[PDB]
Amino acid sequence: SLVSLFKNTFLKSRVIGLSFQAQRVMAQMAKTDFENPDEHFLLNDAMKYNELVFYGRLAENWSINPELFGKAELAKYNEAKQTLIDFNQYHALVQNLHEFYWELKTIYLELSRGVATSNFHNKREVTHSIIESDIKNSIHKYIQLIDDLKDYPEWQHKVREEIGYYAHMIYTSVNHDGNFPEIFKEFNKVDSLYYF
Amino acid sequence: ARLWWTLDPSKYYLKQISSGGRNEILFTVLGVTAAYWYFGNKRCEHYWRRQIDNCQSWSRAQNINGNNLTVKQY
Amino acid sequence: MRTKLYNAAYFLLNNNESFGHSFGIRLKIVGLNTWIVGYAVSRYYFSSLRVKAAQDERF
Amino acid sequence: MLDDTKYIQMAQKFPRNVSVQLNKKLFVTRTWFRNYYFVGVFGIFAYFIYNQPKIFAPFSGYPTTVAYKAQPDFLNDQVIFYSQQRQNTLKNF
Amino acid sequence: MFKELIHIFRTYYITFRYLKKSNINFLKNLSYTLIAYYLIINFQ
Amino acid sequence: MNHSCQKVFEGFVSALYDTSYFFRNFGPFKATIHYATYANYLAQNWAPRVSYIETSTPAYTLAKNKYAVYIVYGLIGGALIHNYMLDNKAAQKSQQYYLKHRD
Amino acid sequence: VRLNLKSNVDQNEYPFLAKWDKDMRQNYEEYQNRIDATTYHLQRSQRGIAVFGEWMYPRYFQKDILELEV
Amino acid sequence: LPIRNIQFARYHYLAAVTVFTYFATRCCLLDYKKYYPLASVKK
Amino acid sequence: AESNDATSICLESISGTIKGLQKANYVVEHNPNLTSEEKKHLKQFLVYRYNPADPHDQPKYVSYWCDIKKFPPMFLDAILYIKNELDPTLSIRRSCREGICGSCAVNCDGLHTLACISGFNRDLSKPTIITPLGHMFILKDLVVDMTNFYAQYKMIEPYLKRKTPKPDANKEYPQSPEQRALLDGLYECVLCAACSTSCPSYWWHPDRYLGPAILQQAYRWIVDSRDEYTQERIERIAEDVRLDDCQQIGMCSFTCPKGLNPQLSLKNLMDMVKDFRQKRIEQEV
Amino acid sequence: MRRIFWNFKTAFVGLPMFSLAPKNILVYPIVVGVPLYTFIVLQNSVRGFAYFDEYDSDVKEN
C-alpha cells in the first residue's frame, strides 16, 4: 500500500514535529492576553501556531495503520496525538475566555462611545436598563468564572487582570447612584478593592 | 513623531523552509510556462488576422425570438 | 446611573510648541497620503462620468 | 533565557471543563460592527481594484460586437437588416 | 504602511476598536491578494 | 427601547447567533473552513520569495540558496526576450505570407 | 468643418430627412468640440515620452478611444 | 541576522509600490481635454 | 414602561451641542453684589464646579474676586483661601503642601501641574482659570478619578524581583555609584499623572496604552541593576500598544513639574524593545 | 444641556489649528506635485502646445 505508506509517513512527520513545538506555542498563548491570544503569532512570528491548529484535527480524526509503525515509534505517535488533543482543548478554552473578554470590551466600548467628546449626536445623561442588565449579567458570569477557576491560581490571576480591567473601567464610567449598588453588588465584594 | 518608513523586508515573512530556501525556482518555472502559453496564444490570435469585406461576410439579421429583423417606416 | 463626564484637555490646554511640532509632521504625512488617495479617487470619478448628450434628448 | 515558569505551568495545567456562556446580543453586535467596518470601508478599496481596470481598459471585457447593414423595402415600407459578427478592436487611434 | 494605516485608524476612531487582530490580519491578507491581482491584471 | 421591540430584537439576534454558530460548526462546513484557513495561511505566509534570513554558515548553505535570485532573474529575462523575438518573427512571417499571397 | 445650423432639406417632401439633418447640424458644433478635445488629448499622450507616453499609448488609452468612437 | 538579497528585496518593494501607484493614480497618463481650449491650432 | 427614544436623544444631543457652543464657558459670579471699583483691586478666579451627586447640578465656572495680598502666591493657596473664606464646599486633594505627594495635580491656568508649587499671574486684569485634569473623569469640582492610573501602575509589577539568591543574607545588593546615578533623576516621580493627562496618546487610548509615568516607572525598574527580570519586563511592556502607541510628543517632559524626562525614558524603552525583538532572533540560533 | 469649556483663541484646537494645519497639510503636495506636475505637462510639449487639427476647422460650409 504505497498510498497508505505515504499517508502514515506524512501524519507521523507532521504530528511529531508539531508535538515538539506545542509546549512553546501554548506558553506563548498563555503569555499573550485575551484580547488577541494569537497576537504574537499574527504579528511577530508564527511559531508553528497555524500548523498546530491545522494538524490537531488531523491527529484527532485521521486513522492510523499500526503495521506501518514501530513499538517506540507508535508510543511516540500516541504521545504526540495526546499532546495535540491537549493543545486543541487549551485553544478552545483560550478562545472561550477571549470571547468573554471581548463581550466585556464591547460593553465598555458602548459606554465609551456614549461619553466620547465627538459624540455630539448620541449624548445620553442616564444609563439605560438594557445596558445596565447586560453589565449585571456579564459581571455575574465573570464572578462565576472566577469561582470556577479556584483550583488554578495563575489562571484566576490572569483572568482577573485581563477581563476585570474593563469591569473596573465600567465601574468608573458611571456615578454611584440609581441602581449602581445592585448592579455592582458582586463586583464590590473583592473585585472593586483589587482595582484601586 | 516617530520615523517608520523603510524599504527593508519584514522578519515575519523572511523565514526559510526546512529543506532550504523558499520554493522560488519551481514557482518561477511555473510562471514562465504560464506566461509562455498566454503570450503564445495572444501572439497567434493577434498576428494572423485579416479583414475581408464582401457580400458573403453579411448574414440576415434576426431578433432574439429568431424571426427576421424588419422595422416598419412608421 | 448618571454617566460621568470630563473636559477634553486640548480644549483647555495652552498651545505648546511640542504639539505643533509633532502634529506638523503628522499632518504632513496625512496630507501626502490623502492627496494621493484623493487624486486616485478623482481620476476614478471623472473617468466614470457619462458622455455629453444632445439637447432635449430622451434615452 | 526568559523566566517563563508560570506561563509553562499554566500551559501544562489548564481546566478542561470550564466554559462561559456568551451574550448572543453582544456577540452579534461586535460581529456586525466588524461587518460594517468591512463592507463600508474595505469594499471601497476592493471595488476600486476590481473596477478601475475595467474602466481604464474596457475593450478587453467585450471581445465580440455586431455590425449592421440596412436596405430599403419600398413596396412594404420596411427596413431589412443584415448583421455581422466582428472582433471588438480599437479604431481611429 | 498598512500597519501604520490600521494603527492610525484604531487609535483615532473609537468604533474601529471592535475589530480583532484576527480581523485586521484577514483584511491584510485580502488587501495583499487584491494588490497582487491588480499588479498582474494591469499588465494583461 | 419598547419591551415588545426588545423581545423582537432579542429573538432576531439569537436567531443570527444560532445561524452563524450552526454554519460555522457544521461538520462539512467546519472541515471546509479549517482546511481553507490552513491553505490561506500557507499561501500568505509561505509564498515564493527571493530574500530570507540566512541562519546557516557558508559551509552549511547550499549553492541554490545563493544563486536562486540570479536563476530567477535569468529565467524571467530570457522568457521576456524570447517572447519579444517570437513576436518579431511572427510579424515577419505574417507579412511575408500575406505579401506572397497577394500584393 | 463648421456646418451651418439651417438645414437645406425640404420639410414638405422629406420631413424625417429634414428633421434628422436639422438635429445633426444643431448638435454638430458641440460634438465636434468634444471630438477635437479627445483627439488633442490622444495625440499629446502619444507625444509623451517613455512611460509618460509612446511606450504605452495605444494599449492603455482605451477609454479615450471608446469615447472618441461614441 | 544576515538577510539574503536584502538589496534585491528593497528594490522589488520599491518597484512594486511605484508600479501600484502608477497604475492607481495614472499620474504619468494625464488628461488634456481641459487644456484643449488653451492650445493653438495648425493647418 | 419605556419606548424607543433614538430620535428624541439625537435631537436633544444636537440642540445641546449647538447651545453649548453658543454659551461656552458658562460663568456664574459668586458674589454679584460687587462694585467694579472694588473689582479693580481684586483678581478674578474662574473655578470649575460640578457635583454629579446632585441631579440638579451641571458643570460651570464660578467667578471669585479675591485680594491676592492675603495669602502666599500659589494656586493651592488661592484655592484654599477661596474654600475657607468664600465657599467651603469646594473639593480638592492636598496632602504635602510642598510638591511631594502630587495629589494637587490640576489644570492650573491651561497647564497641568501641582497647584502647591505653581504661581499664578499677578496681573489683576487677566483672569485665572482653575479646572481639573482634562481627560480624567470628574468626581466633584477639582477631584478626578485616578483609579485607572493606579491599576495601570499596578500592572507593571513595581517591585524588585531577583532570580539569584543573596550570597550571604547579611549584606546589601551591591550597586556602584554609577549604577545609582543611572537611577538618579528617574525615581523622583510622584505619580501626579499630569504628564499622562497631557499626553495625546493617553487621551486617545487610556487603557490599551500605558501612561508615560507608568512606562517611566517600568524603565526605572528595568535599568535598575539589582533586578534580574530585565528581559521579562521588556517583553511584558512590548505587548500590543502598551508602549508602541507613544509618538514622542515630549509634552510629558515639558509638563513634568519635577523636571524629569519621561520622553527620554520612553525613547530608551523603545530602543531596548527594538533591540530585544531583533536579538530574540539573532541570539537564539 | 451639554456645557462645553473651551478656550477658542488659546487652546491647541482653534486659531492655532487654523494657522498650523493649512501650511502643514500642503507641504508635500505643493513641493512634490507642482514640480512633478510641471515636468509631466511640459515633457510632452517639447516643441509647443500645438493641436494638430485632424479635422477641417478652417473650412466653413458656403
Ligand SMILES: CCCCCCCCCCCCCCCCCC(=O)OC[C@H](COP(=O)([O-])OCC(O)COP(=O)([O-])OC[C@@H](COC(=O)CCCCCCCCCCCCCCCCC)OC(=O)CCCCCCCCCCCCCCCCC)OC(=O)CCCCCCCCCCCCCCCCC
Ligand atoms: C498550478 C496549477 C494548479 C493549482 C492547484 C491548487 C490547489 C489548491 C487546493 C487547496 C486545498 C486545501 C489545502 C489544505 C492543506 C493541505 C496540504 C498541507 O497541509 O500542506 C502539505 C504541504 C506541506 O505542508 P506542511 O508540512 O504543513 O509545511 C508547512 C509547515 O510550515 C512546515 O514547513 P517546513 O519548513 O517544514 O517546510 C515544508 C515545505 C514543504 O513544501 C513542499 O513540499 C511543497 C513545495 C512546492 C511544490 C513541490 C512539488 C512540485 C511538483 C508537483 C507535481 C504535482 C503534479 C500533479 C499531477 C496531477 C495530475 C492529475 O512547506 C512549504 O514551504 C509550503 C509551501 C507553500 C506554498 C504556497 C504557495 C502560495 C502562492 C501560490 C500562487 C502563486 C502565484 C504567483 C503569481 C505571480 C505572477 C507575477 O504543503 C503543501 O502542499 C503546500 C500547498 C500550498 C498551496 C495551496 C494553496 C494554493 C492556492 C493557489 C491560489 C488559488 C486562488 C484561486 C481563487 C480562489 C477560489 C478558487
Ligand SMILES: CCCCCCCCCCCCCCCCCC(=O)OC[C@H](COP(=O)([O-])OCC(O)COP(=O)([O-])OC[C@@H](COC(=O)CCCCCCCCCCCCCCCCC)OC(=O)CCCCCCCCCCCCCCCCC)OC(=O)CCCCCCCCCCCCCCCCC
Ligand atoms: C466647506 C464647504 C466647501 C465646499 C466645496 C465645494 C467644491 C465644489 C467643486 C465642484 C467640482 C470641481 C471639479 C474641478 C476639477 C478640476 C479638473 C478639471 O478641470 O478637469 C476637467 C474635468 C475632467 O478632469 P480630468 O482631466 O478627467 O481629471 C481631473 C483630475 O483632477 C485630474 O486632474 P489633474 O491631474 O490635472 O489634477 C491637477 C493636479 C494638481 O495637483 C497639484 O499639483 C496640487 C497643487 C495644489 C496647490 C495649492 C496651493 C495653495 C496655497 C496654500 C498657502 C498656505 C499658506 C499658509 C500660511 C500660514 C502662515 C505661515 O491634481 C490636483 O489638482 C489634485 C486633486 C486631488 C485632490 C486631493 C484632495 C481630495 C480630498 C479633499 C477635498 C477638499 C476638502 C476640503 C474640506 C474643507 C473643510 C473646511 O472635466 C471637466 O471639464 C469638468 C469640470 C469640473 C466641473 C465638474 C462638475 C461635476 C458636477 C458633479 C455633481 C455634484 C456637484 C456638487 C457641487 C457642490 C458644491 C457645493
Ligand SMILES: CCCCCCCCCCCCCCCCCC(=O)OC[C@H](COP(=O)([O-])OCC(O)COP(=O)([O-])OC[C@@H](COC(=O)CCCCCCCCCCCCCCCCC)OC(=O)CCCCCCCCCCCCCCCCC)OC(=O)CCCCCCCCCCCCCCCCC
Ligand atoms: C459621490 C460618491 C459617493 C460618496 C459616498 C460614499 C460612501 C461609501 C460608504 C460609506 C460607509 C461609511 C460607514 C462605515 C464606516 C464606519 C462608521 C462607523 O464606525 O460607524 C459608527 C459611527 C457612529 O458612531 P456613534 O456611536 O453613533 O458616534 C459616537 C462615537 O463616539 C463615534 O466614534 P467614532 O470616532 O468611531 O466615529 C467617527 C465617525 C464619524 O461620526 C461622528 O462622530 C460624526 C459624523 C458626522 C460629522 C458631521 C460634521 C460635524 C462638524 C465638523 C466640522 C464641519 C464643518 C463644515 C463647514 C465648513 C465651512 C468652512 O467616523 C466615521 O464615520 C468613519 C468613516 C467616515 C468616512 C466614510 C463615510 C463618508 C460619507 C460621506 C458622505 C456623507 C453624506 C453626505 C453629507 C453631505 C450632505 C450635504 O459611524 C456611523 O455610524 C456614521 C457613519 C457616517 C455617516 C455620515 C456622516 C458624514 C461624514 C462626512 C465625512 C466627510 C469626509 C470628506 C470626504 C467625503 C467625500 C465623499
Ligand SMILES: CCCCCCCCCCCCCCCCCC(=O)OC[C@H](COP(=O)([O-])OCC(O)COP(=O)([O-])OC[C@@H](COC(=O)CCCCCCCCCCCCCCCCC)OC(=O)CCCCCCCCCCCCCCCCC)OC(=O)CCCCCCCCCCCCCCCCC
Ligand atoms: C475551481 C478551482 C478549484 C481548485 C483550486 C482551489 C484554490 C483555492 C483553495 C481551496 C481551499 C478549500 C478547499 C475545500 C475544502 C476541502 C475540505 C475537504 O476535503 O473535506 C474533507 C473533510 C473530511 O476529512 P476530515 O474530517 O478532515 O478527516 C477525517 C475523515 O474521516 C477522513 O478520514 P480519512 O483518513 O479516511 O481521509 C483523509 C484524507 C484521505 O486520505 C488519504 O486517502 C490519503 C490522502 C493523502 C495524504 C497525504 C500524502 C502526501 C504524499 C506526498 C505527495 C507528494 C507529491 C509530489 C510532491 C513532492 C515534493 C514536495 O481525506 C481527506 O480528508 C482529504 C482532504 C484533502 C486532501 C488532504 C491531503 C493534502 C496533502 C496532499 C495533497 C497536496 C499535495 C502535497 C504535496 C507535498 C507534500 C509534502 O471534510 C469533509 O468531509 C467535507 C466534505 C465537503 C466539502 C467538499 C469536499 C471536496 C473534496 C475534495 C477532495 C480532494 C482530494 C485531493 C485531490 C488531489 C488531486 C490532485
Ligand SMILES: CCCCCCCCCCCCCCCCCC(=O)OC[C@H](COP(=O)([O-])OCC(O)COP(=O)([O-])OC[C@@H](COC(=O)CCCCCCCCCCCCCCCCC)OC(=O)CCCCCCCCCCCCCCCCC)OC(=O)CCCCCCCCCCCCCCCCC
Ligand atoms: C480558499 C483559499 C483561501 C482564500 C483566501 C482569500 C484570498 C485569496 C488567497 C489565495 C492564495 C493566493 C494569494 C496570492 C499570494 C499572496 C502573497 C502575499 O500576500 O505575500 C505577502 C508577502 C509580503 O511580504 P513582505 O515582507 O512585504 O515582502 C514583500 C517584498 O516585496 C519582498 O518581495 P521579494 O523580494 O521576495 O520579491 C518577490 C519575488 C517572488 O518571485 C517569485 O519567485 C515568483 C515568480 C513568478 C512565478 C509565477 C508562478 C505562477 C504560477 C501559475 C500557474 C497557473 C495557476 C492556475 C490556477 C487555476 C486554478 C486551479 O519576486 C522576484 O523574485 C522578483 C522578480 C523580478 C524579475 C526582474 C526581471 C528583470 C529582467 C532583466 C534581466 C537582466 C537584464 C540585464 C540587461 C543588461 C543591459 C545593459 O509576500 C512575500 O513575502 C512573497 C512575495 C510576493 C509574492 C506575490 C504573489 C502574488 C500571487 C497572486 C496570484 C493571483 C492569482 C489569481 C488567480 C485567479 C484565477 C481565477
Ligand SMILES: CCCCCCCCCCCCCCCCCC(=O)OC[C@H](COP(=O)([O-])OCC[N+](C)(C)C)OC(=O)CCCCCCCCCCCCCCCCC
Ligand atoms: C461630502 C461630505 C463632506 C462633509 C465634510 C465634513 C468635514 C468633517 C471634518 C471633521 C474633522 C475632525 C473632527 C471630527 C471627527 C473627529 C474624530 C476623532 O477621532 O475625534 C475623536 C476625539 C474626541 O474624542 P475624545 O477626545 O473623547 O477621545 C476619545 C477618548 N475616549 C476613548 C476615552 C472616549 O476628537 C474630536 O472629536 C475632536 C473634535 C474637535 C472639534 C473642533 C471643531 C472646530 C470647529 C471650527 C469651526 C470654524 C467656523 C469658522 C466660521 C468663519 C465665518 C467667517
Ligand SMILES: CCCCCCCCCCCCCCCCCC(=O)OC[C@H](COP(=O)(O)OCCN)OC(=O)CCCCCCCCCCCCCCCCC
Ligand atoms: C475622508 C473619508 C471619506 C472618503 C470617501 C471616499 C469615497 C470613494 C468613492 C469611490 C467611488 C466613486 C463613485 C463616483 C460616482 C459619482 C456619481 C455622480 O454623482 O456622478 C455625477 C452625476 C452627473 O454626472 P454625469 O451624468 O456624468 O453628467 C456630467 C457629464 N459631463 O450626478 C448625478 O447624476 C446626480 C444624481 C446621482 C447622485 C445622487 C446622490 C444622492 C446623495 C444622497 C445623500 C443622502 C444622505 C444625506 C445626509 C445629510 C442630510 C441632511
Ligand code: SF4
Ligand atoms: S513623570 Fe513627572 S509629571 Fe509624570 S507623574 Fe511623574 S512627577 Fe508627575
Ligand code: F3S
Ligand atoms: S507626552 Fe505622550 S506619546 Fe510619548 S514622549 Fe511624552 S509620552
Ligand code: FES
Ligand atoms: S500639596 Fe502635595 S503635591 Fe501639591
Ligand SMILES: [Ca+2]
Ligand atoms: Ca535590569
